Subunit: 386 residues, 4 copies
């Protein structure tokens, strides 16, 4: 009954089930969880692995000695459970030093510090077997117009990512980077606010092949955009390196609900696309169990993330395999969208009278697209009402 | 007193002052304007030129004879006034045949028709001296998830733009293309919804040098994004080929208010950036005088567009030239944002103990950015309260 | 298999299935439907009745003779099918005369005209057996701040509704009014923008008992609000006189999708509430079949409205009847929310040491609410995954 | 030069300039300020008074002894400076016990606790001379649909406010309540989300005369609504008891920028209305100096709040006094909006042929409203460009 196994590739950040519940208006409602306990509990629920920021695993300001100890305990829990660590990232947002950003802070000394803190964590990530390193520039941006010259800030962001690519290349590491967009919060406006802006930026880096995107469901929804459409553009460009799955109720603060909550129809269309395109990376959940819950509620919320992905996978698969759906797709001319407009070439098109001079515009205009019938078949499949 | 002249490069679409006032819930409140009359009235107000869709100038379905007549009258009005035509575009959205799109309609025959209608208008545009040809794919998108496979639609969009580039190259024309994003309306979701998504798409075309963006103030604001930030990214990429100026009150239907209405502070920061970066293209207004107005109100609204740009230009210039502002910019370390993080190189950075091992994080964190004082200087300059 | 019957009380506006597909950027894609044909087709699908604006039934500017003829044909179709007319309303938005509003236009003569046009239609509505008369003030509002003094406009709106109440009272009619809010579109801002603002306004009318609200799903969603919460407040006040059901994808133009599309989880919670509270009015659909469809698509979309309500009714009923859900509701203390806080009275509360002096705040704070488990039970029931 | 004095009635919450800068993603960037220091610094800048939550003044869990000491020091600073305390409120949101709400928590014991904590603070407020007591129910709401039955929660909210009214009446206090709406954050949806919903709720309380609203600029803007329109409805109902002034950039997290930032045109129209209507309550700022600033930046931000109100007051006054504006108001028929539609009565209206039978609809429709010219006069006055 929709039971996950390690083969489903479900992963969770330590900071997700570990969120203590502090919000802008309230204190923590839960005690801190030791990373070793989260690894054990997630493994029991059927997860494949975990991810971390540097500061989630090793407390900020730890001595080299303390650092080694934290790593050793963690590595033991991974060995004990068979859990993997497919991705890691850096915290460049919590400490006060990063109040104006890491890579794009106005202060040059802070920008050099941000790069060194990042490089230290890349080494660790490689040691633990991570294949992807995420960068979320949560403090890169502004609340007022004069505070940041965006052209100069993009020069600084490019400079930072180029240096990181030179580092991994020089070291011979087998790791790629994934930039995660967000439109706002905590800054009034954040740089590279959507998947489009991040894809465009990557094309100006020195070694574009090393970088892709890590889109998050609720971030594109904070700009009112269609998440499945954004993922289709990332897949088309060959840059979907990783993904963050969760839920969000429209344009408001970043909610990070469990996957399946928020926009359920968009969750269905997202699973349909990931499974049809054969995405083979981790299915990572970046969510927060609400602060109303105790520890029992935390694990119920984490289990619900995986259950909803499995129900949606079954329903999308039943939709695509139904002969009545296959017929409706041809009725709506999805087969014709997939054929070239003019494989015959420019000259042939220019010489074709059926394309203009003798094209019957009124007859073509009267043809219904039959999209409502197709969408109701999709609704019936989602609801298990066939 | 803020009087425009042709040297200010202010331009208007025929469809702007020519909007009859039909909305989703109401009939037209104004009679149609002849294009010749709009050219004469705009020239009297101090505009530099006009732009058009094919269908604004030559009524859809016109015979070759009628076509020649419409063009001749128009060319006479331009000669009589000294007005120029710096940009043109195609209507691929009004006729019912385009109900599912032009370049990405599911029906192949419609896609071939859309290309031929476009090519016919490129020839005309060149004849009239246009330097830029805009493409707004207002019907490219969907209301439901199964109706459009986005990967296949992006293949079709790329195919169309590649054919257009082959056409202009083969003809030896001196014209470039500018894609105009919009997130929604009239389709539920439109493809290439923001400037970021359009910039990323251009990088996959066969001759990327031929294509840039035509951002519009109110479109990026329909996704809650910061317009000046989006323009800074387009300038950084070298792709700001043209711009549409107007006003919008937040996330709602596309209002197309006169420039200066809507978000006034964002209008100030936009003018500051265009003038500092030395943008030298047209200052084009894509607006609609509200349907509450008669013809006197139409021309007052058009004049207000140009007046507000001129007031904002004066205030931004006074801001940048004030010694007290120059001092506040250094207080907030804008000068340091413009210097390279590590011109010394990767190895030097790795060997620099002042960047990590001996960096005083607490001292750097305590330094205030002085952004509020800078922003209040900007407020005082905008309001003429210095 | 989810087949509607007249007993389900499903109703449709003539303007819904009759929408020709004209949008702000495009011409009509469908021919006009005769009202008699819509009555017959809806009756075959299992609807209970239809509603109309004056102008949908009798073309604007019709002579008394033509008026009688249109009514007679309509009455014949109702008799032939057994369809009823439970609600009617007035068009005070399409004609150019209403460009600044009907009841709150600045011009006094227009305000008197709007009242007379309304009264003429109340008489007709009563003749046809309507129990509710809706008022949607789509043109009451503004695009700019100086154009409308809102205090004076609310005086004018109150004056209009008071006169309407005096009219129905004097005539001895058995009809009540329902005001329908909308936040924007077609005006930049519309007066009484949400259900809250309309409920508050009703309390200042001379005979408040005669007026309630007609909320619409997508209108409250255009302000990012929770529709089921707004309906619960209207039910609490005893003012849910009628409802408009449809779908909307977030904050954007008014989409009017078929019911069940848009926010599916909010559709589930809405049906749960209407059925639990025993709402007994019509289940009216105010939707537009997308302009991509032909007539076959129109009727498929209308049938889908009713099907989705019936599937959701079954799932909400299965949720409330499940013993495991009843247990989870007690686990989350929904039973305690329904008990008075202090039936003992103020003095007893003040004297109760267990309420303050000896209340163990830490013990109460540690109690989890178990909301995630409850919400996953609701997800499983919606998906038919129990 | 726009220097405030105590006579301008400018007030600030202790929590405003006292915000340490902790956000959902970061630690505090400033040290805590002693309330005595904030009183002294605000008095030097020209403020009239301060406001507080119970927990801002007396640390949660303080003994009666400690409580008396905190109050005494505060009262000394007020006496030393001449500052007043016009409003106070309760913190029912920070402590973990309030995770599901105060007045509407599902747990009955928590609801009784919330009432006692509130009553204790009403006594203190009266002692300090407050005239208004604000209630912001920031935790009253939900993240999921089954967690809260809204009808039962509104019964509980009414019960709480009724008990509070019985308390003040029994004690003979001269204090009134003001409910402050917010649509979301920290809960997914908050109950009474806008000024409309709060006004409607007040009408169902036992002694409605004791309660009004405390609207906040950025809260109504989080729902995309027009703030000046909402304030006009509150003034029309006679319920504008207090106001919170700040700035917000559209639909996103609650920014609490300084007043004048965010939507500057809406700030202009708000000042115009408060000054024209003769609002005589405090001009209270509920803002947060951004976490990028040090203490110098905090006081610059607070001073900017008052400066911007004074500049806007001057510009709105110059607008209303300009003869050319007075003429444009008559051109747009604002004078006619203020006259009754039908002082003649219902029968006279029904008998008036000029209102229907002989009304020339086409002539009335052709009359332009001249709103664009009026709005450009308002723009010129705001910018000091007359
Ligand atoms: O909104 C914050 C984030 O999404 C964060 O969890 C990134 O995924 C990792 O740094
Ligand atoms: O929203 C529609 C448009 O912006 C349009 O005017 C384009 O600029 C030109 O086709
Ligand atoms: O947005 C327009 C409407 O909702 C309209 O159909 C009303 O329900 C009836 O006048
Ligand atoms: O968003 C939080 C608030 O607005 C708060 O400061 C209230 O005004 C006072 O409890
Ligand atoms: Mn997030
Ligand atoms: Mn994330
Ligand atoms: Mn536009
Ligand atoms: Mn445009
Ligand atoms: Mn609607
Ligand atoms: Mn409606
Ligand atoms: Mn706020
Ligand atoms: Mn507030």
């Amino acid at each position: 009954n929709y039971q996950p196994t390690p083969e489903d590739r479900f992963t969770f950040g330590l900071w997700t089930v570990g969120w203590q519940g502090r919000d802008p208006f309230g204190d923590a409602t839960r005690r801190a969880l030791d990373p070793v306990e989260s690894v054990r509990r997630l493994a029991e629920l059927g997860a494949h692995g975990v991810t971390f920021h540097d500061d989630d695993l090793i407390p900020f300001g730890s001595s080299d000695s303390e650092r080694e100890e934290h790593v050793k305990r963690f590595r033991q829990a991974l060995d004990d459970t068979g859990m993997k660590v497919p991705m890691a990232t850096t915290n460049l947002f919590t400490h006060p030093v990063f109040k104006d950003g890491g890579f794009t802070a106005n202060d040059r000394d802070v920008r050099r510090y941000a790069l060194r803190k990042t490089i230290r964590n890349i080494d660790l990530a490689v040691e633990l077997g991570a294949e992807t390193y995420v960068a979320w520039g949560g403090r890169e941006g502004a609340e007022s117009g004069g505070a940041k010259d965006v052209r100069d800030a993009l020069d600084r962001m490019k400079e930072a990512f180029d240096l990181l690519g030179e580092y991994v290349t020089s070291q011979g590491y087998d790791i790629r980077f994934a930039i995660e967009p967000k439109p706002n919060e905590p800054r009034g406006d954040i740089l590279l606010p959507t998947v489009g802006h991040a894809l465009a930026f990557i094309e100006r880096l020195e070694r574009p092949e090393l970088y892709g995107v890590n889109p998050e469901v609720g971030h594109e929804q904070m700009a009112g955009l269609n998440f499945p459409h954004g993922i289709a553009q990332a897949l088309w460009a060959g840059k979907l390196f990783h993904i963050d799955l969760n839920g969000q109720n429209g344009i408001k603060y970043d909610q990070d609900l469990r996957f399946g909550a928020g926009d359920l129809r968009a969750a269905f269309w997202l699973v349909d696309l990931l499974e049809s395109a054969g995405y083979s990376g981790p299915r990572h959940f970046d969510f927060k169990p609400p602060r109303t819950e105790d520890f029992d509620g935390v694990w119920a919320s984490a289990a619900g993330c995986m259950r909803n992905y499995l129900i949606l996978k079954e329903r999308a698969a039943a939709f695509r395999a139904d002969p009545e759906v296959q017929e409706a797709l041809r009725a709506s001319r999805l087969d014709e969208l997939a054929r070239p407009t003019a494989a015959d070439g420019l000259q042939a098109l220019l010489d074709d009278r059926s394309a203009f001079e003798e094209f019957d515009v009124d007859a073509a205009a009267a043809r219904g697209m039959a999209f409502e019938r197709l969408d109701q078949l999709a609704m019936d499949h989602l609801l298990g009402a066939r």
